[PDB]
Assembly symmetry: D2
Homo-oligomer: 105 residues x 4
Amino acid sequence: FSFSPEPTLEDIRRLHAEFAAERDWEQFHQPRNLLLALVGEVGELAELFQWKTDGPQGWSPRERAALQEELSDVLIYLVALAARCRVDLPLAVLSKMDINRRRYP
Amino acid sequence: FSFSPEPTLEDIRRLHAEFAAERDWEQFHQPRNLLLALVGEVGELAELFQWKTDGPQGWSPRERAALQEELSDVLIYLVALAARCRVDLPLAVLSKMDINRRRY
Amino acid sequence: GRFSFSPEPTLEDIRRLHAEFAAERDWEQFHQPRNLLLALVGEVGELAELFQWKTDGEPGPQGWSPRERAALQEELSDVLIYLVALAARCRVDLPLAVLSKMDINRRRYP
Amino acid sequence: FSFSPEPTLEDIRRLHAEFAAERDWEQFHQPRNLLLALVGEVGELAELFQWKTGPQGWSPRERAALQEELSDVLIYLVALAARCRVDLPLAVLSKMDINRRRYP
Ligand SMILES: CC(C)[C@]12O[C@H]1[C@@H]1O[C@]13[C@]1(O[C@H]1C[C@H]1C4=C(CC[C@@]13C)C(=O)OC4)[C@@H]2O
Ligand SMILES: CC(C)[C@]12O[C@H]1[C@@H]1O[C@]13[C@]1(O[C@H]1C[C@H]1C4=C(CC[C@@]13C)C(=O)OC4)[C@@H]2O
Ligand SMILES: CC(C)[C@]12O[C@H]1[C@@H]1O[C@]13[C@]1(O[C@H]1C[C@H]1C4=C(CC[C@@]13C)C(=O)OC4)[C@@H]2O
Ligand SMILES: CC(C)[C@]12O[C@H]1[C@@H]1O[C@]13[C@]1(O[C@H]1C[C@H]1C4=C(CC[C@@]13C)C(=O)OC4)[C@@H]2O
Ligand SMILES: [Mg+2]
Ligand SMILES: [Mg+2]
Ligand SMILES: [Mg+2]
Ligand SMILES: [Mg+2]
């Protein structure tokens, strides 16, 4: 299994910044607003799993549709938040992976 | 302001699965474990912000170090979760954005 | 006078009420700890959705719209119900655990 | 299994309000501050469970952590309800009525 090669994280940051700036929403995207929107989307992701004990690759296409959306909503707000904080998220993830290799040899 | 072009979401998925297999951690990466690890990291992000009543850009280097690392972990667990579910996260994001444009 | 909670239901009352609600529907079989935990997370997220675009500033939640206030009451209530259920399902005596946490907090912040 | 009869929710609110007043902390207890701190405590609870594909069979130290994090979540939920002037025990009764109509 693997992801498609695109959109990348930068693609996602650009599409969302453009989406938001065309609608004059950037004035609502203070960090703590985006962090709570993230929390709320993580909450909608959790509602999909809450009555489903470990035993999603076998869910129906329809309930995998709801899962794709909620995973996407989390990612979009996470990218918005990181960008609002001037954090280069793909490089931060390489720095974190490097730390993890050294901590767990 | 922008992000660097690499690693990609698929880059991240790969690095972390190899990292996890090499340590026989796959066995702990059932969907709901990864969902709850994601929740734990979002909480660590909230603890950074909880008493910042009403600017990350001009935060101290230690706080910016904490922010970068927690945002990274959220993204890693999110990618790993989506892979464990066999969801193509980049295309799903693109579908969602269309939904978002149709809704607004 | 100054603001107060009502005296009932207590935490034990809520545990009983919720257990009866589940028993009436045959739902206890779905109330494994990790199920209730993720249910709590979903409700915490619905609470966050009420506040996400609302910057802090008096008057605050007390000056919200009637339906916004109703949604706040229902969301705070939902978090509490699943917390009680989770604690009960883990065999945690929540009222006494609170007393014990308040002593921990007094030592940490003398 | 049952809960002890005390402290009630009103007891918890008073104890925490006096604890906060004594330390001059009520100035930091804006609603979104308390909400984010609640989110943080929920994350710590998530962490006790994340790698656990039963709580009663957990070690005494893990059960101690579980008691403490459940209690933290409850104190911040209480603090937030009060800061919002929500009579939390009565709201619960209304909520149970709502649930009975949603699920006849
Ligand atoms: C005032 C109230 C009726 C209100 O809820 C708020 C917010 O102002 C928004 C809202 O319109 C909705 C759509 C929101 C949206 C944002 C940014 C902010 C929102 C614009 C985002 O990130 O995605 C969705 C509505 O007017
Ligand atoms: C199968 C799927 C569409 C499903 O979602 C699940 C769960 O099985 C439930 C569900 O009916 C809904 C409502 C749920 C409910 C419970 C416990 C379990 C639920 C019964 C609870 O705690 O409050 C609400 C539906 O069948
Ligand atoms: C058994 C207990 C002491 C235990 O907590 C568990 C889990 O087994 C882990 C743990 O070792 C820690 C590190 C964990 C790690 C994971 C995946 C699973 C963990 C391996 C991950 O992706 O992030 C880091 C520890 O032994
Ligand atoms: C400035 C920073 C290092 C700072 O973190 C903030 C907050 O001001 C607090 C803090 O001191 C810690 C303890 C905090 C506390 C509160 C209320 C607010 C806190 C007082 C609460 O509810 O429980 C714990 C520190 O100065
Ligand atoms: Mg959503
Ligand atoms: Mg972390
Ligand atoms: Mg609800
Ligand atoms: Mg804690």
